[PDB]
């Protein structure tokens, strides 16, 4: 599913991401924009042989099982395919675990390089929330 911007903001808000660990909703929408272009089905292979999955491009080396990342963990206790669903629940629950990890949203490279330090509230402007 390719979400609309405000559609995704509302989904993320209902799932409790607004101000989760102090990260306002626009941070999460911005991250999704530049990680996946709002496409839940996005998959991208990484140089280390892991793969990133879903609307927040969550990685198989640590967070989900894809059966093809030797030595990896599955800290969200899910198949990586669960991160590709049109329903964002699994991605949200896993993202909450990731961001409670020590580095916060710096775990997301697109957030760090394209959202951090910017006017992220622009990503929710105009939306009915
Ligand atoms: Cl915001
Ligand atoms: Cl594996
Ligand atoms: Cl293994
Ligand atoms: Cl949803
Ligand atoms: Na894994
Ligand atoms: Na990445």
Curated annotation (Swiss-Prot):
GO MF terms, alphabetically ordered = beta-N-acetylglucosaminidase activity; identical protein binding; lysozyme activity
Keyword terms, alphabetized: Allergen, Antimicrobial, Bacteriolytic enzyme, Disulfide bond, Glycosidase, Hydrolase, Secreted, Signal
One of its GO biological process terms is: defense response to bacterium
Active-site positions on this chain:
35, 52
Q: Subcellular location, in the record's words?
A: Secreted
Instruction: Check the record and name the CDD domains matching this protein.
Output: LYZ_C (cd16897)
Which residues participate in substrate binding? 101
Disulfide-bond pairs as recorded: 6-127, 30-115, 64-80, 76-94
Keyword Hydrolase in annotation: yes
Enzyme Commission number: 3.2.1.17
Q: Which Pfam families match?
A: Lys (PF00062)
Q: GO CC annotation: what is one?
A: cytoplasm
Q: What is its main location?
A: secreted
| Domain C-type lysozyme span(s) in chain numbering | 1-129
Give additional notes from the record. Answer: Lysozyme C is capable of both hydrolysis and transglycosylation; it also shows a slight esterase activity. It acts rapidly on both peptide-substituted and unsubstituted peptidoglycan, and slowly on chitin oligosaccharides.
Question: What's the subunit arrangement here?
Answer: Monomer.
Q: What does this protein do?
A: Lysozymes have primarily a bacteriolytic function; those in tissues and body fluids are associated with the monocyte-macrophage system and enhance the activity of immunoagents. Has bacteriolytic activity against M.luteus.
> What is the protein name for this chain?
Lysozyme C
